[PDB]
Design a protein around this ligand. Structure first.
Ligand SMILES: Cc1cc2nc3c(=O)[nH]c(=O)nc-3n(C[C@H](O)[C@H](O)[C@H](O)COP(=O)(O)OP(=O)(O)OC[C@H]3O[C@@H](n4cnc5c(N)ncnc54)[C@H](O)[C@@H]3O)c2cc1C
Ligand SMILES: Cc1cc2nc3c(=O)[nH]c(=O)nc-3n(C[C@H](O)[C@H](O)[C@H](O)COP(=O)(O)OP(=O)(O)OC[C@H]3O[C@@H](n4cnc5c(N)ncnc54)[C@H](O)[C@@H]3O)c2cc1C
Ligand code: SF4
Ligand code: SF4
Lengths: 340, 340
């Protein structure tokens, strides 16, 4: 009897591999054409905290399951119906396949915030307003960091933190957790490629928690001369030659009008746009902010509101790769407990 | 053979229970007289993010293993020698017992920072300078938040963040990760008990990441009127009857001299004082800052530098309870893979 794992990103790749390593078969259902989740589909460059290229690090997590006979992979597929009870579930797939499964682990991840939803910060208005995902792709493709307007190397880059996060006005109250460290990492990578480029990070708080404090926040300043300015950004405009970052220096109303060649948005981790459908299909409760709800960890690790259905990773909220992998292995550990 | 789990806090309690739930026996070695780790021996009150009392939440994690015949608990015991290879280890315990084990999981945790090590901030000088652990104990005992000097209810409380963290001068470069949220939680608990008490939190950054942003940072301000001031604290002194917090108000570079009844230190999570001994005994590498090193998560989740030895939780660095529990379940999952 296999365990159904839904979503083939870092979390689903970790859960299926962990189960295969104890001789438990699984079926991995992935909606996209390829596995790897956001780090692969979105072309991430070097990951935090390892410094390894996502194509290699997550690519290896994909490779090792693609030829493991205990894992049946279904790409370009979704679960259209799910019924039954623990050790007696039936999952029907979009291609007509029916799977008799013991349990299900939801590793369906998140959705990148679309910066068109924060219009005052200029995304979609000006080509040189880019997301962190675009910068990751410029680096990971080896093309390099360049302005989209004319292909030039930027001499001044601003990174705006909290784009689509910590923003009650657009219904996104959460902190997306990893964007501070990702921005510090990207700022160092920009500086390594472009030694004449000045990088400024405009923030509300810097949240390089744990080991990220010295490895990313300190290092970005001392080795790479990245500048950090506490400011509430009002808008991004254009004077026809440069982009202009307008805001209030500190937490008060001290006006700032600073010119830049490129403005990067540290976009947040929205709940997966498919969560209302996943909730209806699997019969699992959602968190008040739209993520898939998880019970407290002291009881059954990774449990959803439904017996026999588990959840791990960014499906539950903004989350890092290391934590998503730990959660996925733990949810696999909980699903195995149903066999007694 | 059984799996050896060292340290009976949240992580060790989670690993042993998860193994027993799949029929794998374990031996839990705990140096102290009781299980529960820091939340129990340090008398934590309500936990984040659950809001449940640690005595109930972690107490249940202890209870459920104390009568599970698949788990052999050895309190007041340490591992004095460890030798062998995966599926062929021998652990010798301080009580003379010898354990033939398949693998070992290190869940040996951390050590609370002692603020006698930041003397300019008044700990040990004045009875009303307390740690967050002391405030947790005032609440969890049901005695309530009271000044040690005369037993009065404080009317003004200051919480100083980053005590023993983010401080290169004392060799503690890391961010201790959970103290921002713990302080916001404690500030709300103080306000709930003492409606006439004003609580001020002095910070460098507020790091209520993920779901903690709206549940703790925003709620502490909007529902509980907790005040947050960005400031670098130079010293804590006394005028004879009250404490004086002296610093520099970051936002508008101007000095501050503010009176308080109680000053709380948000103490950091140092590496376990036993880590050099554990490293020597188990033959595992340490992180540059003294924690137990963990390999990257993309390979084998929870692996140390030594084959067959795993690590989870605050042993690796400052860590939350939910993350420590997930990591412990994941390390149990990796230890099970050694059976092939
Ligand atoms: C710019 C940027 C850089 C980042 N870099 C880092 C970094 O360096 N380090 C770090 O720790 N974190 C990083 N993160 C965070 C990282 O993206 C997440 O931790 C990680 O992708 C979460 O993995 P996951 O498996 O939970 O979800 P995802 O990566 O979102 O994978 C979910 C998978 O499920 C699939 N899926 C979705 N819906 C369905 C459905 N209905 N049916 C079936 N399949 C479905 C998706 O197609 C996808 O393949 C970064 C984030 C951003 C925005
Ligand atoms: C004031 C305060 C409040 C906190 N509140 C929260 C909260 O609300 N929510 C949250 O998520 N986090 C909280 N934390 C963090 C929390 O304490 C940790 O996440 C948690 O204790 C880590 O669990 P652990 O099992 O890794 O380690 P520990 O709790 O440190 O347990 C380690 C165990 O191993 C034992 N041990 C140590 N050395 C040896 C050895 N040589 N041999 C054998 N046994 C050994 C110890 O005696 C102990 O029982 C708080 C921290 C502080 C300082
Ligand atoms: S991690 Fe940093 S950039 Fe991301 S939402 Fe939180 S405070 Fe903003
Ligand atoms: S979590 Fe907050 S209080 Fe703790 S070290 Fe980090 S910034 Fe300081």
């Amino acid at each position: 009897k296999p365990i159904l794992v839904v979503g083939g990103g870092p979390a689903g790749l970790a859960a299926t591999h962990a189960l295969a390593n104890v001789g438990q078969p699984s079926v991995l259902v992935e909606k996209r054409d390829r596995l790897g989740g956001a780090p692969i589909f979105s072309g991430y460059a070097k990951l935090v905290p390892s410094g390894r290229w996502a194509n290699e690090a997550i690519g290896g997590m994909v490779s090792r399951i693609e030829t493991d006979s205990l894992i049946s992979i279904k790409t370009n597929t979704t679960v259209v119906s799910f019924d039954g009870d623990p050790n007696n579930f039936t999952a029907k797939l979009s291609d007509g396949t029916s799977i008799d499964c013991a349990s299900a682990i939801l590793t369906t991840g998140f959705s990148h915030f679309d910066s068109v939803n924060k219009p005052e910060w200029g995304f979609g208005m000006f080509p040189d307003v880019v997301t962190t995902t675009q910068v990751e792709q410029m680096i990971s493709s080896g093309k390099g960091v360049r302005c989209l307007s004319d292909g030039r190397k930027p001499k001044r880059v601003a990174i705006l933190l909290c784009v689509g996060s910590r923003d009650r006005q657009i219904g996104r109250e959460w902190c997306s957790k990893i964007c501070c460290t990702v921005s510090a990492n990207l700022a160092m990578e920009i500086r390594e490629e472009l030694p004449d480029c000045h990088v400024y990070i405009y923030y509300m708080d810097i949240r390089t928690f744990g080991h990220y404090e010295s490895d990313y926040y300190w290092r970005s300043q001392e080795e790479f001369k990245v500048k950090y300015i506490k400011a509430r950004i009002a808008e991004v405009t254009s004077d026809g030659k440069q982009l202009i970052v307008k805001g209030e220096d500190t937490l008060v109303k001290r006006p700032i009008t600073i010119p830049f060649d490129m403005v990067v948005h540290a976009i947040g981790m929205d709940p997966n746009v498919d969560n209302m459908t996943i909730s209806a299909i699997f019969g699992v409760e959602l968190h008040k902010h739209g993520y898939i709800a998880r019970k407290d960890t002291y009881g059954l690790m990774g449990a959803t509101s439904r017996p026999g259905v588990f959840v791990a990773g960014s499906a539950i909220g903004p989350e890092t790769i290391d934590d998503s992998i730990a959660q996925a292995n733990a949810a696999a550990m909980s699903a195995l407990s149903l066999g007694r």
